[model samples]
Target: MEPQLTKIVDIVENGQWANLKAKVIQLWENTHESISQVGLLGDETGIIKFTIWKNAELPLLEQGESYLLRSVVVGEYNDRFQVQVNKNSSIEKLSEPIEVGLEHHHHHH
Candidate 1:
């Protein structure tokens, strides 16, 4: 399959996604697990909720950091879309900051 970039608005429930490069917009400890963080990731398109399950073996993503994520799984809860980062997914921090805003209204690229 051709690797296509994904945006927050493009996310769908139970969708399998890949190649999502975005910035950490918000983060908080998940109520379900202490080791996991639930947050928002923003790109030029929009912001989407994401989860970072940081187990002893799984890598973690920092707040206010830009990352290129691969093989992220999409999930839905309470009619909201969320991305899941597991041990199988890859997270790479980019050298430059990811431009974030709602449809380029706040931050222009």
Candidate 2:
């Protein structure tokens, strides 16, 4: 998978979840049909709503833990950004916390 360091805010485009790392801030109930786990995830930049599908065959993402996720798809729903982890997705717990650096942009006058 072609993985890259992408900010959660930049996840507006559809792409694979490869190399995506984030911290679990909260967890919601799981759905048997579509999603297995749902929760609030965050990085140094910000937080977002996330989910792991049942077909993904992945365990529930523990709260307050950082993980490296792969093969999932990042896309939009209800006009907001979201990620879906399916059968292709893989997840691994990370020992270190996610570090989000400040972004720099210059305006033209």
Candidate 3:
């Protein structure tokens, strides 16, 4: 089962782990330090984090959409879902829009 993405570009929290995958809702590669790849994603649940590797290809995901990531796996390093894309997994923007929230997320201790 895929998880809903909910945060924009916030660091993971401690002991917070969840498996989630969805279409690349919004992708933006940051060349600046600290953050490498950051974006938003959506699934059946909500919107969360969508982390990309150093040079991962940032795909275009339309608002209110979803993607099927069969055999794909997700994990949370801190508190957000760490997107995992491999040979067995894939991403495709769905024709219908998926559910999500509009609240901005910021890391808090």
Candidate 4:
């Protein structure tokens, strides 16, 4: 069964599978060989980090575009929360746009 759509701000529990509809607010360079893509996804509620596994072979998410991420696993890294896209997950581009909110700023340069 498909999981209920979750907001970026509401994703707190680790190891849970979740679906999300959010915009790609930022796309960062891949720091690991096992990771295909890493970036920030945001909705009107907030923003959170996302990782697409290389083995998943999912479509690249473009910055500023909205998409539906299905069956992604919630994860926690160093006390921060994120979503992991694996073989069980799917990515669908959306025609509608998302207005991102600034409720979270967990990034550093």
Candidate 5:
């Protein structure tokens, strides 16, 4: 069955991490390939990982904010659901302003 609308909140709910797009609250340049490559996305539900790779052309999420990840490979990665950004993924920055209310909880909407 297709994912429910509310179910979209949690990115890791499906347990099949691949080709999926999410948001990233905090990431670093030195982050591990397994975790760093994964872009943590959030909807009304929660945060999900969008794997970033040399070929994956997806949106480059900003720190202390949120962005939508498009055309990412969502599936299972080593039994953990995550996004895989390859060399072809397009990293687009959201033009809409993101207002971070707090420093601990990254979720806004």
Candidate 6:
């Protein structure tokens, strides 16, 4: 059975598996050997951090590109939510582009 498609902003629980259709928003330096890629993924709803494990051997995801991410495990670190792509996960680039949303932030005096 296929996992339910979830939005980035709705990813709240740890260890929850979900499928997402989003665009690569930003990529950070891969500081760990076990990590193939570390980046931000976004859709019209919101953005979330993502990590592709080296063991997955998946193709590199380019910035500004949209993709269908399947069976990715949701993870929580320091109260922040993220997703992990492992060997069981899949990533397919989308032919159509996706509109990414900005992360809302509030400032106080």
Per-model lDDT: 0.73, 0.74, 0.51, 0.82, 0.48, 0.82
Error of 5 at 99 (Å): 7.9
**After aligning candidate 2 to the native by TM-score, how far in Å is the CA of 39 from where it should be?**
0.4
lDDT of 2 by residue, 34-76 (tens): 6678887777768778777776678777777888776667866
Query: Model 4 — TM-score against the truth?
Result: 0.83
Q: What is the lDDT of residue 64 in candidate 3?
A: 44
lDDT of 3 by residue, 3-78 (tens): 6443324324433333344655676766864445667665545556655443434354454456654444455656
TM-score of each: 0.74, 0.77, 0.47, 0.83, 0.51, 0.83
Alpha carbon lDDT of residue 54, candidate 2?
Answer: 73
RMSD of 5: 6.6
Task: Extract clashing residue pairs from model 1.
Answer: none
Measure candidate 4: CA RMSD.
Answer: 6.4
Candidate 4, residue 13: Cα displacement in angstroms equals 0.6
Worst 10 residues of 5 by lDDT: 14-23
Question: What C-alpha lDDT does candidate 3 achieve relative to the native structure?
Answer: 0.51
- What alpha-carbon RMSD in Å does predicted model 6 have with respect to the real structure? 6.1
What's the distance in Å from true for residue 30, model 5?
A: 3.3
Give the total clashing residue pairs for model 6: 0
Please give, for residues 1-109, the per-residue lDDT of candidate 1 as tens digits.
7567866766654667667898887767656664467777878787788777765245556778898888778877577777877777777789898666334455554
Model 6 agreement with the true structure over 12-33: per-residue lDDT tens digits: 6789887889888887768688
